[PDB]
Amino acid sequence: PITKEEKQKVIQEFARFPGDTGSTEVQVALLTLRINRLSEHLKVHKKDHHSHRGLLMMVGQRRRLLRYLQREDPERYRALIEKLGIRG
Amino acid sequence: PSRKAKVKATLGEFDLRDYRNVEVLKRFLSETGKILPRRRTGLSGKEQRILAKTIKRARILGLLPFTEKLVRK
Amino acid sequence: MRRYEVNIVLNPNLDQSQLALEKEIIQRALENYGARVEKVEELGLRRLAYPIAKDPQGYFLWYQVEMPEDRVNDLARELRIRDNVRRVMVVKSQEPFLANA
Amino acid sequence: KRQVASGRAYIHASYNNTIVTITDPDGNPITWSSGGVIGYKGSRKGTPYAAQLAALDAAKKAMAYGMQSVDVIVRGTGAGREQAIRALQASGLQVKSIVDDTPVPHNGCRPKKKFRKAS
RNA sequence: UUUUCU
RNA sequence: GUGGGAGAGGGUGGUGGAAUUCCCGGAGUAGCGGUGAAAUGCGCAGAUACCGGGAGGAACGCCGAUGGCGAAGGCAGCCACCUGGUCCACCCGUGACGCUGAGGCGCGAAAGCGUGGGGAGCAAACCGGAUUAGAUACCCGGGUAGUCCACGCCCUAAACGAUGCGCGCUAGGUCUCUGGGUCUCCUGGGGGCCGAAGCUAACGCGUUAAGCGCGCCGCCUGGGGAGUACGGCCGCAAGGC
Ligand SMILES: [Mg+2]
Ligand SMILES: [Mg+2]
Ligand SMILES: [Mg+2]
Ligand SMILES: [Mg+2]
Ligand SMILES: [Mg+2]
Ligand SMILES: [Mg+2]
Ligand SMILES: [Mg+2]
Ligand SMILES: [Mg+2]
Ligand SMILES: [Mg+2]
Ligand SMILES: [Mg+2]
Ligand SMILES: [Mg+2]
Ligand SMILES: [Mg+2]
Ligand SMILES: [Mg+2]
Fold first, then answer.
1. What spacing in Å lies between the alpha carbon of A73 and ligand 2's midpoint?
2. Which of C9, C89, C97 sits opposite B15 (nearest CB)?
3. CATH topology of domain D1-119
4. Contacts with B41 (C-beta within 8 Å, 6 or more apart), sequence order
5. Going by beta carbons, is chain A in contact with chain D, meaning 3 or more pairs sit under 8 Å apart?
């Protein structure tokens, strides 16, 4: 599980400014996190199809956020990915 | 008419989550290791749902019977 | 980590030597698995609701530990090994749910 | 011959017969009877009367062994169940106690068609 | 038990 | 985002007791079983009924609901681990980032197929008994595939609410599951019932709409021929579209 610690570590880590809890960058960061824990959990458990739908929704939501991000500030975009690891 | 006295009233406060308080749990079983319905336990959807789980654990820890022979008859 | 409750029931026919012996293997067990004992209860011999291993009685324990979740399962894999240990139930600690209180 | 004095009276009632097995305080059968043991052969076997007779008989044979006291253990539902019981209560045996101990699965084996459909 | 057609 | 909550949602490992079957031991003896009646069948190599021990498979009684969870299929012994969804509170953060969705991709009850394993109970086919004018059936005795597990296929269904998804608007009453609050009431999420207006061929629906509206998808165009023929794509096959 993602502990409060690990989480808020990411939040600050990507936050646009002091107190930034839900910006495209933060959100995309948190999603990326979960997507990885989950994608991992499914390497083992090839048959947990129910959770897989979760993953599918998470990825989708991320795709949308980024799509919007790039649409708005294409720079913040290139930055986010690189920093994270997306597009890969 | 399931109107004698709900096992709840005939009992002080207690932690429904206690899987070892035999003396208390025992109260919720019948003349058999069967879990009394709510008309009997006098509990409630949420409570009863706990009681049950608790009772099962006690069962496994050889602390509560899964079943008993019926007398009288 | 997390707060667990380890219940153990063993042979009620153990002499103070045998009894103190298993409690030793248990202690090392807990230890070798990062289990830090917060407190302990030992009700001792109690009347089972039904025989367990032909025996009509049981000697109960109750070690409340704090250990790594990633090893609770493995911890019990070991505890059940003792021939006199005839019951091991590790439960997650939970706030008591009062009622009619 | 052994003289048992007190013992158990297992009644295997059912929608097809009913059979009684008197036993010693350890469960070892002394004597037994049934609808068939008595004259009865087929359908008649499961009747409550074929149970009364089987009970008294099983009881008589039990007296000859020295039996005087018994503990009844009813098992299964069936005509002749509560009859068998009354048959015993009478007889030369004293019925110390009565207990229903019919076996019931906590849902384990699939019943044959005859008994499927319920819950 | 079952127990067709008109 | 922070702080709470309920749940048979899912995956892995482990583990509990009841019951059936088989095996061993004891004690006991003439039947048991089965039906409308019976018979096949099982039993003196000792069955049935009773007690003790062992093995194995499969399913989890009460709790259990008129209950809950999930997108659907569907999900209930207990424990731990891994994991999806979701509701409430605070109003903290982003700032239209939204809805729908041809095709694609994934999931998808049962039966069925391939490889390996397993097999207690049940049981297509089948082998018998009976019933009948006949009985390729209904009832009874056996019984193989299968039902179980793993991996890979198949993709169908009364896959049903026979009701596509999202949003806004339109009396109330009553029961219930779960959360909050100043908690005999108020506020939110969910499951039911009666009903305003309104709708409906009628039955009925009615804030969980089948009412009033906007967006997008799918589909229908008399019955038989026929979900057939042909073609194509898919499948090991059955067969699917
Ligand atoms: Mg969760
Ligand atoms: Mg604000
Ligand atoms: Mg602003
Ligand atoms: Mg199947
Ligand atoms: Mg197969
Ligand atoms: Mg059969
Ligand atoms: Mg048959
Ligand atoms: Mg399928
Ligand atoms: Mg409501
Ligand atoms: Mg009207
Ligand atoms: Mg109505
Ligand atoms: Mg035409
Ligand atoms: Mg082909």
1. 23
2. C97
3. Nucleotidyltransferase; domain 5 (3.30.420)
4. B6, B7, B8, B28, B35, B47, B48, B51
5. no
